[PDB]
Design a protein around this ligand. Structure first.
Ligand SMILES: NC(=O)c1ccc[n+]([C@@H]2O[C@H](COP(=O)([O-])OP(=O)(O)OC[C@H]3O[C@@H](n4cnc5c(N)ncnc54)[C@H](O)[C@@H]3O)[C@@H](O)[C@H]2O)c1
Ligand SMILES: NC(=O)c1ccc[n+]([C@@H]2O[C@H](COP(=O)([O-])OP(=O)(O)OC[C@H]3O[C@@H](n4cnc5c(N)ncnc54)[C@H](O)[C@@H]3O)[C@@H](O)[C@H]2O)c1
Ligand SMILES: NC(=O)c1ccc[n+]([C@@H]2O[C@H](COP(=O)([O-])OP(=O)(O)OC[C@H]3O[C@@H](n4cnc5c(N)ncnc54)[C@H](O)[C@@H]3O)[C@@H](O)[C@H]2O)c1
Ligand SMILES: NC(=O)c1ccc[n+]([C@@H]2O[C@H](COP(=O)([O-])OP(=O)(O)OC[C@H]3O[C@@H](n4cnc5c(N)ncnc54)[C@H](O)[C@@H]3O)[C@@H](O)[C@H]2O)c1
Ligand SMILES: [Zn+2]
Ligand SMILES: [Zn+2]
Ligand SMILES: [Zn+2]
Ligand SMILES: [Zn+2]
Ligand SMILES: [Zn+2]
Ligand SMILES: [Zn+2]
Ligand SMILES: [Zn+2]
Ligand SMILES: [Zn+2]
Lengths: 335, 335, 335, 335
């Protein structure tokens, strides 16, 4: 049956993220549903929230890569039934604004500060109350919870960005960072037919980037590669040093995608951006529609997320390891 | 008759901009044509180059807003003939690469730095040798040399940016700076149907902005105006302070156009740009096709450039005035 | 107060459109609301349903240009309150599908056959039950019901089409038909900044087109006009003769918009369409977001719908006049 | 050495396509070059010209899929050298109009009726005079002349259309016709990552379609496939019946690409195109930039044109087999 209480990690600004053993298990009201978390991923963004002032709100269960099984549905829920395996659409769009009707519910202003695991409660618990079921994607039968969870951000974000940049078979792109996101960016990009060059400061990540399909992998681009030669540069790190590499190597009218959140601000050379018409396109998570596209690509085997799983109570240990860039790929937790 | 020597203003990194009374006038070889300058405009970019280290080559006659009359055509040229009134397409693209064949001849790599008045010789002289006649647009009979001169940049640049921003009747835009480019941007934007709000530190510029069609003008945007409510923000100043205004007032997925070149670098808030998918689009001058459109808009009266003229030998006195923001609109010179 | 029974014109396949005196006044369930019709427009499409046997469904109150005031809201409805003046979004999207969330709720497969007044009940009655209020747009205070009504189709449709064609100040377009939609297409197009040439076989319509802002109006295009010289051709008639005019005068890569529905099938010259890459884009009504864009353009005075009002009971007399192209612009009715 | 006379096939409205053993060998004038034809392909289009009067001009050497080696260069030709292996860009744009500058040199008006082998002389000869060298693309060393010839149209045309339709990894497309163009369209579509369904009346073609990578291949779509379920429908046949299939199976807002020229006219159901906003996009050959993209994709092994070669003098025989749809893929000839 479904318990009266549960354990989970709650984030509070004065105490950080804390394990709580006596959390309530909400019973879904009309239009809501209860999701039993099967897998929740750890995104590097949680590190920015907890340790670097990335402000998303206060006192909420973290964990935004959520995959679970419908455990209970409130009155009026007809689209979902207990037993349905689903993954959460991070942005948690309101569903009624011009954004949520305009194919871009990821930037819904009403939902700003109310994202799953980033403002609103997330997956670092046993039972998640979903107030808006519209923000759910059905997980295909052949896709595991662990992979589905990673798919909601580690894959979704790169997919959304790559789609936005309109990558194609004539694309010659550069990806900076081959971690959780970068690793899936490689596979998504290859699916679009692009040539992919990867940069990463960690040898292990570089080795993995190669196994995943990257056409070229380096720690530092050789002097032999020409500046202003890439059609698109996706920066999954976003510190000034990496942004500078993108601006140097992107071709005229090419695009720079600062997906990474490694700094509060970044500067660009104005004379260069203007005269060569470089485009800096912000990209955030992904849309409800994108998620459906994504789970389909994973299901069909085009994207295989590097995932490793562990018990949810081991989370603090893995956060520490992540802080030290001590592992490759993604790690997901089973509550 | 065509003289064998001329006067003009030559820019050198060591001696700045200097008047030369012994510049050479060369009959055009095959493929080339000699243009007699009728009007050449003074753009603020010239101030950046002469006084602020904006790197635009060395050792060439300045003046990049050029309108004139063909004085001689080399053999092989059959697209133009003596007497034709034409305006120069600044970027001076090679016309044979993938950029030039791809509707973006303004970002041609082969020709990077080979720009009229900003790398290659320009209009601050009596005769300009044009080596690539393809980079000329016919001036309509009812458009004066003075107006056509201003149109090649002051009107062309903002037209190119607005067009790139896909401005429309549903647009709510903010323009910062109502000088040479700004005043014309107001008119172009109104032609596209946008609502225009202008910011300028100088009363005279605000008044002109208003006379030209701006819906609202201010020295300081009222703090009560909702942040993130403009679909596009065109910054024709580009210093850190104005860029910050753009990022604060641009709506989600909206666009920031840093057309101005007032600083070597500009920084943007990373979390804001990413989470709200803000776009920063570099825009440079205009294309050959763009200029034809611009000259048609001007001939039709949709854009009426604010212009006043003087003898080219008065350039020094006007450079100082523009440097002190002493006049409104554009100033053009007649050699 | 709210009456128990009402009058309205119900459409049935056996007996056509007949006036009823015993129509119930539905009490809105949860999530629904009751709209008191203040103004309802007569569209030419209604004639296709009544006389050309255009199958939209059967046994429903017609009238799809709807404007009114909220008379009652069921439980749960909080986005609307009795007294709110709103206009119906014709397509009546379901809201949950990928089309409705994808910025294109006008083609929602789920709501096919359930559009206001064209499958589902409409505005040719006193009180309309609104099952899905997401399909409503608030009417600005300075916009009358009568004008709002015409805005939901007469204006909305050509707006949506014109926007799709990406018209701009460089566009040279041709519109065929200056009636309900045509007259507004003229205004919306001028707003977009395009030069507009209009064709209409009726002098009174040509006279009005000129008054509305058309740059040139004719019955037949003069020989002086070159073929393939229009960037876009909007056909609000759509019979083979008018389509032929479009394909002959549209320029290479240009677009033809068969907005009109005057024929079951139309043919195009394949050789011409392929070699000159002509585009034929289908356009249907408008989206919820389009209507907000539209009502705003009207409130701002950019579009002044030629509207004339009469009492709903006079509908029959007016349908006959429309059948005979006896009047110009739109006629809307006050219940 | 270069002979003073040659043989080739000339088309005339009166005598049809006839072999000539006394054709002159043109000496290149300045800016022009002579090309030694290494391989020329037979496109079904040639049949329409010979037998069905698609009138492209008169008295010209046919054969528009051209690959060869520069035999001679006139004075001033600098970008090309004797011995350079190049493939002709069919449309043979003028290079100086707004279309050629606007990334669409394939619809250049000045060049209408002056295309390689279709108005202007083509490849069914030994030495072709190229009056406009801009319409050449370098053949990579690892691409044979036979394959390159096929790439100038059999691959280029479908590449252009597929690029235009913006196919992607989430695309579910239908291709009708698996001949010369069809077979390559399958390969190009896969490189873009789309799911492909092919239709061909001929068994051998279906069998080849399967070997080329189509996900599903049929003679007739099984009743188990839902109408309006394809994102894009490419018709490489274009007879009323195939178009009808496209209109029935394309999903809302989907696109129909009538690339085939199997009929002088085609009709579309207006009610259906309008309500489901179906798009019909004309597509013609390819652009100079498209060919560079294509030869690169071929060189990279992503597209392997099914090609079989024969002596040019055997052309009369193969034209007959093609009329009889007797062989699969493309057949190219060696002069
Ligand atoms: N824009 C969005 O919507 C969005 C969504 C998810 C994550 N993110 C951001 O993306 C970034 C990465 O997420 P992640 O989970 O993949 O982190 P990760 O820990 O899983 O992987 C990080 C990788 O970056 C590499 N790296 C770090 N600094 C580098 C440098 N200076 N040069 C080269 N390589 C470097 C590391 O070696 C590591 O392999 C984070 O900053 C996160 O906040 C953004
Ligand atoms: N991207 C391009 O291709 C391109 C082409 C031309 C010019 N530009 C750049 O555009 C900028 C303006 O060109 P211009 O000739 O119009 O300058 P201008 O001197 O003709 O007009 C400048 C205007 O900006 C206003 N202004 C200055 N600082 C301001 C501030 N902090 N806040 C608000 N308003 C301010 C001034 O009062 C004045 O009205 C220059 O930096 C120039 O280099 C760029
Ligand atoms: N696609 C859509 O979503 C949509 C929405 C509404 C209406 N429509 C269609 O648009 C068309 C017009 O609607 P309306 O209410 O504005 O019609 P209308 O009666 O209000 O105006 C019709 C005008 O077309 C002119 N006209 C008719 N035949 C002509 C011809 N052969 N040549 C030149 N001019 C001609 C008439 O003189 C008249 O001025 C109808 O066919 C309607 O079904 C389509
Ligand atoms: N628009 C352009 O720019 C362009 C460029 C080249 C060719 N084309 C046109 O494309 C068409 C095909 O060119 P091609 O060289 O590939 O022809 P092809 O002879 O090489 O191959 C034709 C294929 O179509 C199949 N087919 C014919 N009728 C069919 C039907 N009713 N249903 C299903 N399958 C059918 C045949 O079995 C054959 O496999 C021609 O009409 C040609 O004119 C257009
Ligand atoms: Zn994340
Ligand atoms: Zn929302
Ligand atoms: Zn300038
Ligand atoms: Zn170039
Ligand atoms: Zn209607
Ligand atoms: Zn829907
Ligand atoms: Zn062909
Ligand atoms: Zn041309």
């Amino acid at each position: 049956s479904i318990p009266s209480s549960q354990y989970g990690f709650v984030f509070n600004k004065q105490s950080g993220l804390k394990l709580r053993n006596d959390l309530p298990v909400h019973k879904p009201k009309a239009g809501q549903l209860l999701l039993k978390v099967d897998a929740v991923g750890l995104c590097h963004s949680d590190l920015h929230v907890i340790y670097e002032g990335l402000d998303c709100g206060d006192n909420y269960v973290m964990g935004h890569e959520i995959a679970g099984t419908v455990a209970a549905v409130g009155d009026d829920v007809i689209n979902y039934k207990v037993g349905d395996r689903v993954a959460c659409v991070g942005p948690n769009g309101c569903g009624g604004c011009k954004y949520c009707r305009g194919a871009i519910d990821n930037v819904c202003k009403n939902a700003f500060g109310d994202w799953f695991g980033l403002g609103y409660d997330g997956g670092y618990q046993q039972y998640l109350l979903v107030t808006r079921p519209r923000n759910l994607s059905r997980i295909p039968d052949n896709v595991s919870a662990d992979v589905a969870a990673a798919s909601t951000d580690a894959v979704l974000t790169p997919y959304h960005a790559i789609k936005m940049a309109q990558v194609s078979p004539t694309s010659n792109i550069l990806l900076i960072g081959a971690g959780g996101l970068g690793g899936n960016a490689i596979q998504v990009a290859k699916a679009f037919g692009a040539k992919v060059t990867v940069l990463d400061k960690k040898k292990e990540a570089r080795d993995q980037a190669k196994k995943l399909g990257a056409d070229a992998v380096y720690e530092t681009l050789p002097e032999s590669i020409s500046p202003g030669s890439f059609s698109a540069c996706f920066d999954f790190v976003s510190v000034q040093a990496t942004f500078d590499v993108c601006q140097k190597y992107v071709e005229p009218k090419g695009v720079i995608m600062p997906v990474g959140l490694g700094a509060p601000n970044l500067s660009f050379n104005l004379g260069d951006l203007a005269l060569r018409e470089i485009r800096i396109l912000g990209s955030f998570w992904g849309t409800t529609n994108d998620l459906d596209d994504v789970l389909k690509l994973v299901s069909e085997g085009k994207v295989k997320p590097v995932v490793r799983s562990a018990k949810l109570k081991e989370l603090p240990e893995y956060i520490e390891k992540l802080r030290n860039n001590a592992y490759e790929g993604r790690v997901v937790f089973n509550p």
